[PDB]
Design a protein around this ligand. Structure first.
Ligand SMILES: Cc1ncc(Cn2c(C)c(CCOP(=O)(O)OP(=O)(O)O)sc2=O)c(N)n1
Ligand SMILES: Cc1ncc(Cn2c(C)c(CCOP(=O)(O)OP(=O)(O)O)sc2=O)c(N)n1
Ligand SMILES: Cc1ncc(Cn2c(C)c(CCOP(=O)(O)OP(=O)(O)O)sc2=O)c(N)n1
Ligand SMILES: [Ca+2]
Ligand SMILES: [Ca+2]
Ligand SMILES: [Ca+2]
Ligand SMILES: [Ca+2]
Ligand SMILES: [Ca+2]
Ligand SMILES: [Ca+2]
Ligand SMILES: [Ca+2]
Ligand SMILES: [Ca+2]
Ligand SMILES: [Ca+2]
Ligand SMILES: [Mg+2]
Ligand SMILES: [Mg+2]
Lengths: 524, 524, 524
């Protein structure tokens, strides 16, 4: 067998059937003879390739396979890899390298020092020392991406390796099963359970690894047993809990003092599947107030090590959430009361307040919609206004890197064909990965793109105003016609200049058979 | 003085007056109070920021200054940095980092292990250990980028450093002059000159560092004295010689055997300002035929070390070319005969042959036009059909990384306002950095963009055919409306479906006052 | 030809005939069939291997070739590489790697991520992608080590590569000549010369790259023409000037304020072949006083970039010193007056003051002796008391890394068999690389080792006293019998408890036919 045939067999046997890519010559011997049972998804720029793959992996809860071209292709994707690192996305990034005989002279298209290029944004990065090693290296990549804490990996393969003979002993790779589905030993788990049962006013904080693990329902049971309020950890990449459940208390503000104030009076705070904490703004103060103890369950040693406070347990989130939910006592305390309905913001017949948009989306979208957010000045309002009952309903760039939501929304929609995906993207953010729209058109992936057009990098203008910072250049983005960009890439385009037009356009978009972009004129 | 004021003073004193950027919050304390004598050039994605800066630096023959946001912004630019490495572009890449007090907890927007992120594509990469070090680190960056061999550098600066007090002793940085304008010692230079004078059939090969050094005219004198044919080294990023000079012999094919055959019978081959050699295709054979000696002059130790053949001298190209041109004897041999006019390809009233496009551009463009090439299946024909008399007339992605020409053409046009820039870009390549078009519109930088629309990744289809490779996915890019994309970003848009429409559109574009995109229907 | 035969041919053709090594199995296919015209120098630990090679390279002014075993051998040498980086030592470090078929499984003796292991202490680090690339990679290593600024490089080679067929086209590597012997262009050199001629009170500062280049005599001529005092730059790794020449002013103190005070009143300070500056102690103040301009000539871009003051020129030190010495005018100013004789310190019939030792060495040693210094509390006195007339007469650990002098003294003595080497090493420092003594015994390399036994890490005790730092552990090293250690490794051993015994032992050592260690009881 050739290295090509053995490698595709390994991929198939390990559950991979899709290649997200942008082709080049170094990968031609990999891509030729492409197997009929595999699908290739082309995108026009590598940030888009990796963003699509990332959304696919996060929504599918399985690894996604990528093929890029050499250093330039890899490099074009490194912003996307920053997000994938922070979201623990299981991405297998392969990159085509020059033929081994041309690497020393540094021929055009040579990826110099290839394994160092994606660092520090990958869990493992490698170039094999021989062709016959390629299947084994691919096995390593698959498992490294997939073991907790999941994350992106990188494998560079010389052009000429694919046609070489494989080692027959590579067959032992095909059906390897590698598990990291582990939980705290019984003795120490019983201590934790007793601490939770004994708490007088517990609180729960959930992060994105809960949604990745599909541990959401277990966390609902846990919260109901403990009669505890539930927050989402700051800078949330995913939504880990039903947002109209009575226990839900919303997105934590991403500041040190704000969080310790929120947690004051709670004697035990159990954090599951989040870093402690993904703060953002400068908000100095106490990490915790006196009388609060924090206990973190995390799938990631790097998270446990860097927490500035609390105990930690490094384990699989799915396994731990299920165990905890089924072991804790039912508290006799009263169940928390649901948060009230958010206020309706006054809206005239002009430009749309973002709150209006979110309220209308919540009114018209299916109950099993999936939302993506890259509307950076409106996140707090979005989190208050969308009733997200189901797992897998929200994605936000986990490293804050813009250019995620537009391509990721296409990958999510590919992963969840029955669930309508609605990406809410600012006019600034929409540009970073604009060319991803073409993939939605070409493959007829029916994502809806809602462009929040305020003409500015609003979150930056806001921050400069808080700072009283004057004479800051580059904060405005006038003169972009998003309907024309959509037309450029073959996607149906609508405008919404007022509330009536927003409802009419959303009605049209929801019944369409293909992707749709709606440009919304929002208040500036 | 603050670190901000000292740093901007250093930049001004060192000749920097322009910041190419995409803003974020980590850089707000750098960008606020932006000096009135500086200009900020915004682009909508960081590949575009760096590509624009790169074209500006290459055409201006001086460093260009960039400011990006953290890891995601840096990462979005890494493909662009691959090209800048290969072109020896002097780019000073700064990236905003989180406040020092938030780096340990890895707050959102922290650039983890920042100095490692752009490696191996930078000459120097650094994060200062204290605020007061920032001016000194900036000095280091400026000089590292600017010393031969020029190249990109990276500096990560925490948000909170800018407002801190600077060290008064930083004033010693302001007027430092650092020179690498060096040439071979007299004794060894006399040996080289004697070897050139004694050659019976010398040949010259020129690469991009000749054009960077503006050594073109000196090389013309050298060629005329030695009565030697002149080739451009393969995979050419720049044009180092007038292409209708009698000695000019064109672009070398990027293959080992092809080049040694071309050089057969030439007893001494002098290579200036090129790697030896930037081969591309697999074309095995002899590096040199018997009877050929090669001597390379390079500004880059890494080039000299990796050449598989020949002697080398590591020195400044400008200094060496000027010395050699003025020291060699006038040979009594006959001056080479100019290459004939290229053939006119038969053209019907339908889709355009690329040869037709290039011939029409050469007919209608000013004699001091500047061309950029990212039409990857048509490069050989382009090089034969454009009369480029002047230095600085050609750019091509030096690492083969697509997404260079569209933004670089804007930066070149900013650098050379009197010289009409014409970027010839394939329909595939145009997508990688499409959003750069907006910068041309916003700043009214009057670049002309010629999109070669054949509906395919033609160079890849070509290569797959040579290989007889079947079932290769992802090679076609149907369904892109480039006039609509231009409209999207505010750039005047024309179509050319046939030769009459090509001439009419070029006539319109050449008289326009702003940027123009022309979508040309080319033969598939 | 095999890769082994081609590689040894390349080495021989490039002037390498000695391998400094500690063997292991991964290198057995390299070391077998060892050519009869090569010499292998074994040392018992890899810090010793590299230190010996380093002294050999520095004294020979040519590259030295090393072979180590995998990661553990490489790692044992990394302290030695820190010194070699700072001294610009041209070292070619090869390390044996596992067979390619065993690298993926990470068999015992695999060097994981090998090229990253020695970073950041090497100029270039590489593992070839195929066996046939090994000769080309070796060529790259040779030239990278040897081009200015010289320095160490690293090449990792899989076991199985050596026996494979080489590429016949590797013959083009054998006789490549690569030059970096360059100087400032004539126009800018004339400006520099005019600035030197016009100075009213010039000063010269020389660093180790002057001695490496054998530019010492040229610098003497330069100093005499300009009638300028000459200092050695701080933390001096080498001696660049005759220390009893009338212009010589000694070792600069390694502090910011001390140096600017020393240079006050000097209108032009010309620094050659040194960083600006290798400060050590905290001594804050002005980099330069008003009225002093500094101009640096350096072979190293990294030095030129980081200087906090002055202009710089990046060029070959040999070429620049020769040009400057022969172009400057003869000043009519008076020649500086020689420094007086140092004072004789009162010495009783007990333990030796270090000043006594140095005075006695200067009295009894040949005029062409070579000294090494790793007696860290006595350096200033050593520099005042030794008349070093000739180039190549002094070495000191260039990164301050102890464990250099003992092995380096053996390599220097191998390089300079007619020049008596005398290493003056503290009792603390002697331990780091003690096993190097065996190589001197086995190869009968007749180095004299003078152990300054004060029972303490004296320079650290001194510093703790300046700090008024109390309760510092680990500063005393009682209970080491150096005569017994010498016996252990086969080296003749003497003691000197008083001045009479010091003279008698030195008389014995100087007439011996093999290496000798003298343990001197020095004042504490
Ligand atoms: C790749 C990248 N570049 C720049 C930024 C900086 N950035 C920028 C540019 C923001 C403005 C986004 O504007 P928008 O129009 O998408 O949304 P708002 O107007 O609601 O802020 S928010 C922010 O962090 C970033 N996070 N990621
Ligand atoms: C960033 C990146 N991704 C992918 C490639 C691979 N690539 C691709 C995708 C090519 C096709 C470019 O198509 P085009 O339409 O711009 O021009 P032609 O149709 O004339 O080839 S040529 C080539 O090397 C690349 N070099 N750089
Ligand atoms: C490898 C290493 N480890 C530790 C040190 C720290 N060090 C130490 C341990 C010194 C004391 C050396 O003692 P000595 O006996 O050799 O000489 P003195 O008694 O004259 O100081 S000086 C100094 O910088 C070092 N420089 N290098
Ligand atoms: Ca409602
Ligand atoms: Ca699915
Ligand atoms: Ca906006
Ligand atoms: Ca014509
Ligand atoms: Ca200009
Ligand atoms: Ca095309
Ligand atoms: Ca004396
Ligand atoms: Ca010798
Ligand atoms: Ca001591
Ligand atoms: Mg990197
Ligand atoms: Mg290392």
């Amino acid at each position: 067998a050739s290295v090509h045939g053995t490698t595709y067999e390994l991929l198939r046997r390990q559950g991979i059937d899709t290649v997200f890519g942008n082709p080049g010559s170094n990968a031609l011997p990999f891509l030729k003879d492409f197997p009929e049972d595999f699908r290739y998804i082309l995108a026009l720029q590598e940030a888009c390739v990796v963003g699509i793959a990332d959304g696919y992996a996060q929504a599918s809860r399985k690894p996604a396979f990528i093929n890029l071209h050499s250093a330039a292709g890899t490099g074009n994707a490194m912003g996307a890899l920053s997000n994938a690192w922070n979201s623990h996305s299981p991405l297998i990034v392969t990159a085509g390298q020059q033929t081994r005989a041309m690497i020393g002279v540094e021929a055009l298209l040579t990826n110099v020092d290839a394994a160092n290029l994606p660092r520090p944004l990958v869990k493992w990065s490698y170039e094999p020392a021989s062709a016959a090693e390629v299947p084994h290296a691919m096995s390593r990549a698959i498992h490294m991406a997939s073991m907790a804490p999941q994350g992106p990996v990188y494998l560079s393969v010389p052009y000429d390796d694919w046609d070489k003979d494989a080692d027959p002993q590579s067959h032992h790779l095909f059906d390897r099963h590698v598990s990291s589905s582990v939980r705290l030993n019984d003795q120490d788990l019983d201590i934790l359970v007793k601490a939770l049962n004994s708490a007088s006013n517990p609180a729960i904080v959930l992060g994105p690894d809960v949604d990745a693990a599909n541990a959401n329902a277990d966390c609902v049971m846990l919260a109901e047993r403990l009669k505890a309020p539930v927050w989402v950890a700051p800078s949330a990449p995913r939504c880990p809990f039903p947002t109209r459940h009575p226990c839900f208390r919303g997105l934590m503000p991403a500041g040190i003092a704000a969080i310790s104030q929120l947690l004051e009076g709670h004697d035990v705070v159990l954090v599951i599947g989040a870093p402690v904490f993904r703060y953002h703004q400068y908000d100095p103060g106490q990490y915790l107030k006196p009388g609060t103890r924090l206990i973190s369950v995390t799938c990631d040693p790097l998270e446990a090590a860097r927490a500035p406070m609390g105990d930690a347990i490094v384990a699989d989130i799915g396994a731990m959430a299920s165990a905890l939910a089924n072991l804790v006592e039912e508290s006799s305390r009263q169940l928390p009361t649901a948060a009230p309905e958010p206020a309706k913001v006054d809206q005239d017949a002009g430009r749309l307040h973002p709150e209006t948009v979110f309220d209308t989306l919540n009114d018209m979208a299916p109950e099993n919609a999936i939302y993506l957010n890259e509307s950076t000045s409106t996140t707090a309002q979005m989190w208050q206004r969308l009733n997200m009952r189901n797992p897998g309903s929200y994605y936000f760039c986990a490293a804050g890197g813009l250019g995620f939501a537009l391509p990721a929304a296409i990958g999510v929609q590919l992963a969840e064909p029955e669930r309508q995906v609605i990406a809410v993207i600012g006019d600034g953010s929409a540009n970073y990965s604009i060319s991803a729209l073409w993939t939605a058109a070409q493959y007829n992936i029916p994502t809806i793109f809602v462009i929040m057009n305020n003409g500015t990098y609003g979150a930056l203008r806001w921050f400069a105003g808080v700072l009283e910072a004057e004479n800051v250049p580059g904060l405005d983005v006038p003169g972009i016609d998003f309907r024309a960009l959509a037309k450029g890439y073959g996607v149906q385009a609508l405008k919404a200049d007022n509330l009536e037009q927003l409802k009419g356009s959303l009605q049209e978009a929801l019944s369409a058979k293909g992707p749709v972009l709606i440009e919304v004129s929002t208040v500036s």
